[PDB]
Symmetry: D2
Subunit: 236 residues, 4 copies
């Protein structure tokens, strides 16, 4: 079982980042062509602390991928029109077709994160959601979908630095939520305990160094895809 | 065993002239149930499967006759087409789910995965074999929230089914849309019975029950669909602390 | 070939209990029309607008009573909510369009853009004033293909409307629903008459006609909706080189 | 009126491409933030000859734009499930929300291009489609949408070269190459009838991919900025 206490947030990567980044981004383009020809859809989930580096990691991963074959979804907490359905319906509507890629910047795991800590979901709802989500991902992965989920983590000091830099780049609740970091760590740990499956693994990425985090996201995506290619008897 | 099987269904049961009274009463009760579900924002999902010409359409129509049509959709489900095969086989049904408080009726449904798709080989052995648990999990996530689900299997004898095939080709309203495949599948009825019984064994749950309806007498079948729907709605409401 | 106006409608017209005979006959003709539309893969779009409690729901229910529900959807349309305001105001209706061969009924519809949205200010002056032509173009794109469209405005007198408001507050199934909007709209009825008349002047087209229904007598209104629907389907079939046959 | 016969396919751009490209891509990022802040959607249409460079131009335009705010749709001819509706229905389903970006690699103009030439659409259908499409774009642009359409054109020899380079890394592409004169006629008629001030056509000579990409960027940004001015808004920094 994975827990945030096991991640070394001091891990760093130098300027060999340019080399590995180029190699891995072209490898990601190759993976896209493999997925398209074999009609296997790909689902990438990104969770983590605010400003942990989810957007930059996503962009580095899809930089060399053909945009005609992906959609990156920014997910917020359910709004009234979304609350007219079961909480997974919005995600079934956004599923990639076989062979396509869907990226979820935050995802259905909001059910056991912000909705749990803020009380949008009752104790019964979030407590049963682990098994419900395992079932959702299992129905998908028993067919022609691959699922992998990343949790990007940063220290409170690195997060504060990035908060300070973001308000100066003009391109609230977040400062309040920074105060609830221990609760989010506990909720994420329970999430790792109950939904880290061989068919849909969790990868914990220490994100203080953005370059290391981006390369790790790439490495884990490609390794998981490669394992699935081997398990299906296909050539990558 | 208390597993349901079609061989235990008494296809000789019938109903008389008390049909008009019971029918009008139960249809107005169904209107009442619709208003209750709307006020409490609980969606209702009714599944209809069975033999060809067993009476699904007539049962559905009698069930919704006094219900406000602004609050229901009846979906005629066929086998997955190429555009549907681009997704997991449950995606189309997640797209067709009612909003909380609305009613969705499925004339055939996701159980095609373990019925026609099994028998015709559209699904592989692994797919339909694992589909039972997948379907249980799907229905369980819905009913743990704000949906009520009940499923009906309408059955008729081979002789009654033949009589109804013949009556449909003589009806001007129906004779335009009757395929030879129904005549083809009459020969595969034993395989459908085995597949249906395994379905009943594995997916008849308290939160999503199967009701086996003897349909040779249409009046009996329609009254049973109404009664069982209303009784299940009341039981599930009670489990939520609500009273009709 | 004439401008319709609400002031030309005789709200005194009535129909006797000869309602049962014509009603059953017309409902079966509507089933036959459903079969014709499905066989020729022509979709049908029925719009209902009018005063609150003018009888839209009851008219819709009698129209589809003997129609197979696997081939229709009745949409209750309300004013756009935030999630709908993320798109052009017609996007939600394109998402609700019936497939070729199917029937879609709209209890209120896109004409809200020139009715409640105009009167309540949800739409700006420029928005509702340009909506007439926008809507004609929308309906023309649909009817030039394999769709038939017809639109009904149900009208009642203010006294009959008040009587029906009060009788619904005692309807065990109707009462529980909220009705504040209904009293708001009743207070603005003169403006609705003006707005609907401008609508009739600008969007009553041969490929998508407006039918003005005197609704004080519910039986008369139901028979008129059925008769006008079937007559329009017959004419449109003839224009397509097809024959609608009993 | 625009016609492909007036397009100079010899146009070129040299190594000043890298710097201009970087600047224009960052300007497109700024444009995305403006579009998002003001809740104005952007619709980019790409049509042209097979292998004219539409995909690469799209890729350079969105390279530095946040992918949480765009979708690029690869559009093919209507299939049976799409033929259950009016031909514009699929595209209304694909409209971006206010503030979002939607790119169409081929689009509703198939109605008057491939569908006209291959006979998927009858004479009546494709002949009335120009006005239908103008009305569609007009309802969108009178609200909170901006639309611009690009036609990418290449020479027959450059097209053959690119066909050979792709086959060394479908049949329909060779099918359309043989009917290229008819496609030129259809595109000219399209330009004549649907080049509107609110939804302009931009004809891009694509023999030099670098020039074509910079032109798509420049014309997109110029149209967005003009539209900002028309709405009383300032696209600056």
């Amino acid at each position: 079982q994975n827990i945030k206490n096991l991640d070394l947030s001091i891990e760093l990567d130098k300027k060999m980042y340019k080399k590995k980044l180029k190699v891995l981004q072209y490898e990601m383009l190759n993976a896209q062509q493999f997925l398209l020809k074999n009609k296997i859809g790909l689902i990438l989930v990104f969770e983590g602390m605010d400003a942990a580096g989810k957007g930059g990691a996503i962009k580095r991963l899809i930089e060399r991928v053909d945009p005609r074959g992906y959609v990156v979804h920014p997910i917020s907490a359910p709004q009234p029109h979304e609350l007219r359905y079961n909480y997974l319906q919005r995600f079934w509507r956004k599923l990639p077709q076989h062979g396509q890629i869907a990226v979820f910047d935050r995802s259905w795991y909001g059910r056991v994160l912000v909705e749990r800590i803020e009380g949008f979901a009752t104790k019964d709802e979030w407590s049963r959601a682990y098994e419900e989500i395992n079932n959702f991902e299992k129905i998908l992965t028993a067919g022609d979908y691959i699922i992998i989920k990343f949790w990007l983590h940063v220290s409170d000091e690195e997060q504060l630095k990035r908060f300070k830099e973001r308000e100066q780049n003009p391109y609230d609740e977040d400062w309040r939520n920074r105060e609830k970091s221990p609760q989010y760590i506990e909720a994420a740990n329970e999430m790792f305990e109950k939904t880290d499956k061989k068919n849909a693994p969790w990868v914990l990425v220490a994100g203080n160094d953005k370059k290391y985090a981006r390369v790790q996201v790439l490495q884990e995506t490609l390794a998981h895809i490669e394992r699935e290619a081997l398990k299906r008897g296909l050539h990558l």
